[PDB]
């Protein structure tokens, strides 16, 4: 059955640290411990090893990513911008 | 210790220069011929008795033939 | 029951002070001081996590008294690299040299026009 109404993964923290702080850390912990689809082998085995380091179990590929997510929206926009500036630079 | 499988190997092991002595042990089930070489003790196990006696007379001379019984 | 004592002056449960129980011909239990568990080599590719096969896993100084055959595999890079990554390197080398030939031929035929 459903075990908690709303705390979910931050039920391990009990009543401590404040409801808003637990809610804030909840989504970060979910993204931290989530398994992402590897973009190299296609398997859903890309998980965080340390902060900023994301390793795939299958193809043994290690990627530099975000602290809590596999990639940050900042870095994604940066990659798109660098591609656009490269294709503008060359002709 | 090393276990010699057949009889010819025990013969040319006993005919070695470093063979100090041989000890013959008569057990209930078998007879053990143990030659004391430099590094190892080589044991040959003979199940019957006539072959053990034949080996006893075919041991080379100039070697201690100590009986353990 | 019979209780045991260390046989050496190292009295702490350190990594070098590991024992196992042994029954002597005198019908008593004693400590035998074990050797550390050795590890097989890891592949020089540094990608696949398994350790190599056909190589005896011992402490590093024990490899000095082993024969040559016990420490390698009869293959190129044998005992240093895994078979899978050796095949990958063979194919990669051949195909990249073929690609070099292709681009050389391509520029040689492209330079035909002033």
């Amino acid at each position: 059955a459903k075990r908690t109404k709303k705390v979910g993964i931050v039920g391990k923290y009990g009543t401590r640290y404040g409801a808003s702080l637990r809610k804030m850390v909840k989504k970060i912990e979910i993204s931290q411990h989530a398994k992402y689809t590897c973009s190299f082998c296609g398997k859903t085995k890309m998980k965080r090893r340390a902060v900023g380091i994301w390793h795939c179990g299958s193809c043994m590929k290690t990627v530099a990513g975000g602290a809590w997510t596999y990639n940050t929206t900042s870095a994604v926009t940066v990659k798109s911008a660098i591609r656009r500036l490269k294709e503008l630079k060359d002709q | 210790p090393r276990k010699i499988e057949e009889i010819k190997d025990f013969l040319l092991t006993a005919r070695r220069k470093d063979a100090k002595s041989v000890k013959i042990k008569k057990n209930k089930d078998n007879v053990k011929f143990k030659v004391r070489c430099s590094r190892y003790l080589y044991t040959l196990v003979i199940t019957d008795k006539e072959k053990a006696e034949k080996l006893k007379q075919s041991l080379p001379p100039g070697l201690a033939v100590k009986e353990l019984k | 029951v019979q209780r045991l004592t260390y046989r050496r002056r190292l009295s702490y449960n350190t990594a070098s002070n590991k024992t196992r129980l042994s029954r002597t011909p005198g019908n008593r239990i004693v400590y035998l001081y074990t050797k550390k568990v050795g590890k097989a080599p890891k592949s020089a590719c540094g990608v696949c996590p398994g350790r190599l096969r056909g190589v005896r896993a011992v402490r590093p100084k024990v490899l000095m008294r082993l024969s040559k055959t016990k420490k390698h595999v009869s293959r190129a890079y044998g005992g240093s690299m895994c078979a899978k990554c050796v095949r990958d390197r063979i194919k990669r080398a051949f195909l990249i040299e073929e690609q070099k030939i292709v681009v050389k031929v391509l520029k040689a035929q492209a330079q035909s026009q002033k």
Binding site: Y13, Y17, L21, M24, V25, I28, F40, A50, V51, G52, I53, K61, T62, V63, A64, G65, G66, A67, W68, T69, N71, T72, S74, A75, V78, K79, A81, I82, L85, K86, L88, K89 | - | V47
Partner: protein, 149 residues
């Protein structure tokens, strides 16, 4: 340990003798093992490449910027941070850039930098929540944490 940015162990070839040179670049976000990075004046604009700022366009952003032309990277090294190449002037060989603090700095056009943002993301987003977590954080850095007013 002690920094939030992952490090990238990158192996080059020595151009003058038969040897392999191992470097410890600061990992720009997006790079992966088995990737080829290119360092020099003629390197292309890709994440992880190192090339002088003067050869970069007017809006690119960079990771491990040199404060002086010839030392190793000094600016925008902490995780998630980056600098922006604002402007150039071919005469006097100067490039104006924007630092993570928002300040504007004029540097030589020969200063090298890594393209992209440094990995390690929004590490400061997560609340620490625990004096113990703070203790473990600063134990890997230095003796500064329990701060008496």
């Amino acid at each position: 340990p002690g920094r939030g940015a992952p490090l990238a162990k990158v192996v080059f070839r020595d151009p003058y003798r038969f040897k392999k040179r191992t470097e410890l670049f600061i990992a720009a976000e997006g790079i992966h093992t088995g990737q080829f990075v290119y360092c020099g004046k003629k390197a292309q604009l890709n994440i992880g490449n190192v090339l002088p700022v003067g050869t970069m366009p007017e809006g690119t952003i960079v990771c491990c910027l040199e404060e002086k032309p010839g030392d190793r990277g000094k600016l925008a090294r902490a995780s998630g941070n980056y600098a922006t190449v604002i402007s150039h002037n071919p005469e006097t060989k100067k490039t104006r850039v924007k630092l993570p603090s928002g300040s504007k700095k004029v540097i030589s056009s020969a200063n090298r930098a890594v393209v992209g943002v440094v990995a390690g993301g929004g590490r400061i987003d997560k609340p620490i929540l625990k004096a113990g977590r703070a203790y473990h954080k600063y134990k890997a850095k230095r003796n500064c944490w329990p701060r008496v007013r």
